[PDB]
Amino acid sequence: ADLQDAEAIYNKACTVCHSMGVAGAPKSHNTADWEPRLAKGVDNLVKSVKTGLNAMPPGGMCTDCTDEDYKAAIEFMSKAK
Numbered sequence: 001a002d003l004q005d006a007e008a009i010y011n012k013a014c015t016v017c018h019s020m021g022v023a024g025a026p027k028s029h030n031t032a033d034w035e036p037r038l039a040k041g042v043d044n045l046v047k048s049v050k051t052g053l054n055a056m057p058p059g060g061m062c063t064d065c066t067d068e069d070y071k072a073a074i075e076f077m078s079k080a081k
């Protein structure tokens with residue numbers, strides 16, 4: 001839609017599952033949900049999201065979304081998933 005704000009990207013996109021924790025989704029704010037992700041790194045997730053997990057659409061429900069906004073959307077929450 002528009003990647004003018006990393007907040008607006010997660011709050012428009014990662015806002016159906018991760019907001020409340022639906023479809024078994026990992027919480028928008030956690031430490032133990034993010035710990036096992038921050039063990040390997042960060043980008044390891046930006047690839048998974050752009051790829052689409054099982055319950056996730058291929059491309060994190062995005063289209064023209066650049067790593068700057070994508071990573072910023074992940075890092076808004078913490079710095080991993």
Ligand code: HEC
Pocket residue numbers: 009010013014015016017018022023024025026033037045046048049053055056057060061062073074080081
């Ligand atoms: C449902 C409609 C989802 C939307 C929209 C997004 N995500 Fe998601 N995510 C969802 C589920 C059910 C899960 C599975 C949890 C698991 O067991 O792996 C996830 C997982 C992720 C992960 C991986 C977490 C892990 O521990 O491996 C990441 C990195 C992640 N999701 C990021 C992410 C972002 C940034 C999204 C918006 C661009 C997004 N997800 C949308 C369900 C859904």
